[PDB]
Ligand binder design. Sequence first.
Ligand SMILES: NS(=O)(=O)c1ccc(-c2ccc(C(F)(F)F)c(F)c2)cc1
Length: 309
Amino acid sequence: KGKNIQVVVRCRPFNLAERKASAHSIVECDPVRKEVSVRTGGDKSSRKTYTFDMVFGASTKQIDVYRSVVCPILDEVIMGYNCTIFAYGQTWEEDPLAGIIPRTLHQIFEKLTDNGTEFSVKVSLLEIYNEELFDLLNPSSDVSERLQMFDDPRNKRGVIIKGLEEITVHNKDEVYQILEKGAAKRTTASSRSHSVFSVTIHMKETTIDGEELVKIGKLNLVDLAGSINQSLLTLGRVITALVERTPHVPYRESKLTRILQDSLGGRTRTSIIATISPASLNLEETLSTLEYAHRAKNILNKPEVNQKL
Ligand SMILES: NS(=O)(=O)c1ccc(-c2ccc(C(F)(F)F)c(F)c2)cc1
């Protein structure tokens, strides 16, 4: 019993810095066969072909790709699972995982409210920089100060980040106000930092008088920094360990993998969206992203509904 991590690969259009280098196009994205295929030299037919849960070529807008992966997750969140989406590859206009948060909360409110259901919504936003935690929704606290984290015995395989501002959200507008005044704290001059956005959703519903069903749903949106980066590196070694079935999974060897341990062979429903360059200029990074992504789809998680009757 379990669900392997859902992995989608997206290929993005050529960027202008790729045309200037005269790069040629080396990636094929076969959405119907769910295969991305890379030319490994050179005409030559040297190829390496991978299969994924979903594949998107450049013509599919980034938003549509997220949509295809997020909306189905949001229903799982509401059913009461904990879910995590890892975005790796990101960056007219081009937006990270954060840029779809207000859309996310809209659907969530819309599903809940038009269904007369009683709920609360609390959000978090932290940044992992140089192996240190930084809260991005705390307004008054000094911008250069960190957060501490220990192991909570109540959840023996999980952690607690004391000081982290959970913000309650009622209307699909507050998100914008809070979201932007969050980018205004990560401005330091961020290209090497991971951001974890978290939406927690408490839900209550009467069954028959005397009885209530209480569900809690949690979504984490992880925007992984691109490739020296302990979190990224360990993220890799965790992927590898889980798949090769080695006894010791180096979770505690980085803040990111410690924070999101349950997402990797844990009790969380996990999806990964890896974007890849079409350019021959990036064959190695592309070859890399597909290795991790390909290993990742082999990890089994065991999600459980979190609910009390
Ligand atoms: N800097 S590194 O060599 O340690 C490294 C770089 C990238 C990764 C990595 C690349 C892609 C993915 C993903 F599968 F998420 F796309 C991932 F989860 C991890 C892992 C290790």
